[model samples]
Target: ATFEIVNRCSYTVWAAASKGDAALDAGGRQLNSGESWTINVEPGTKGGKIWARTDCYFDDSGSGICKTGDCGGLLRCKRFGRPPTTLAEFSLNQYGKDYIDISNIKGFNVPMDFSPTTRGCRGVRCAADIVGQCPAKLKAPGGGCNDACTVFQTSEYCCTTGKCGPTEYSRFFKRLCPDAFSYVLDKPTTVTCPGSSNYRVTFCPTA
Candidate 1:
């Protein structure tokens, strides 16, 4: 399927995506404000995600680190990124269901919109100033909010055990970004669109 990733923020960002062996990253390129990058994801992809890195730089070899969402300092990444990053997660044509979601479960470095252009399905808008309102305990060092699980690292937050539920921190995140998967068990934020539709993921987008 065809997808477009745009940077609408006032600053530049290095966008990254990965679904191991799923041919995810065309190029984890830098998208300056108002720039866009086109990507192609073939059908039958198992699971994948799109997110951008902040406060980052890379040399010609695509080697650098992102303060918010670094993944081994690679411009092109095949693995999941580090925390404090918003996510546009999807499973293209998975069991006949094209499930897609915008999530801050890892955390929120940038506002995002993940949507399909040709379908009537509702798109996700996670355009909240989570970073500014983040609590001291959950604030990432550089920028963006950190999930409670990332801060506490306990079963209550991480759900390492079979038993887990929403915490106040998760509620705070959900309240800000109603359309986002704010926590591990968050539902009702995931949506489905037609397999034939093209998708777009924009950073710092308008609602």
Candidate 2:
């Protein structure tokens, strides 16, 4: 299977992907507007995630900062990106199904669409302009909207322990993008697609 990352944003975007604790392919790269990169995935690939970083600045040695989704200040991320990012989560060829979702549980910085290129599979996306309408309290430091967990850090917001459900904060994101995982404990956000299908992960699909 292959994962094709398409960047449709007006500005440059740094795309990153990982499988478990190990980095996949080259791990990350800068994709100019309308450019796309593809990373082939072996069968049985599991616990994979792909995300984008915006407004990044790096030096000759490949070290700098990003306005959103910075991973340890490195150009090629060795770990997961920071909060306020749009995540395309996947578990490919697991059991008999492939699990996928676009999650805002860490909050959203970009609009994304994750869909199978092959037929017989459904596509999932969250393409709303969330930054312009982000709640005041959940506003991130640099930009984008932070999840309730990042802002409040309470059990109710984080769903750290016992039974919990959506609040006004989580509903804000859900209302905008109903397909995304809006809260930590949000369920049914995942979609099961056919195994062995290639995926096209697009950033700023509306652009």
Candidate 3:
């Protein structure tokens, strides 16, 4: 079973090793939010030290590298890179993705129980009270954000309960990533590059 690597770090890290190990090299792909990478290796094979650079900007109090519990730490044999380090050994049957939320999608898939309606609320501004509730009563004409729309800047149509005003992006974030270790606005702010203001968002689990 092959495995995957999720770079949940706020900033990009340069993955390298002490030797010519194919698994850990500079040519290795750079992980981004909500992305995953497949890794292949045999079970019980000798694992080497996998280091994540801490030289970048991390959201957690300024820790730039993800080498620990949060997406900022390296994973060796599924264990953290700390004292009493125990590296994870890859198995032949492990061909699926590992670190479900971290190793893939740049760690953007913050685990949350979102219904299809809420899933449709991406990039929108609604009240926290309207998270899982239906958008029928909140509908309006020419409001731009209909019951099916997920991207909105104001609550001209939908008036959520909490504060009964525009729901900030942080509201969706709170519901989506309740337990995530870190939150970096830099990566999530601009889904598209350059002057494109529209956010390129994704589902927490990408259903």
Candidate 3 all-Cα RMSD: 17.8
What lDDT is obtained when candidate 3 is compared to the true structure?
0.27
- Compared with the true structure, all predictions reach lDDT values of 0.85, 0.88, 0.27
Cα lDDT of candidate 2 equals 0.88
| Candidate 3 per-residue lDDT over residues 24-66, each given as its tens digit | 3222334465464544334333332233332333443333343
Q: TM-score each candidate.
A: 0.95, 0.95, 0.25
Candidate 1 pairs with clashing backbones = none
Off by over 4 Å in 3: 16-27, 56-207
lDDT of 2 by residue, 118-150 (tens): 877788999998999998888886878989888
Per-residue error at 125 for model 1, in Å? 0.6
- Show the lowest summed lDDT stretch of 10 residues, model 3: 190-199
Worst 10 residues of 2 by lDDT: 18-27
Model 1: residues >4 Å from true position, as ranges?
20-23
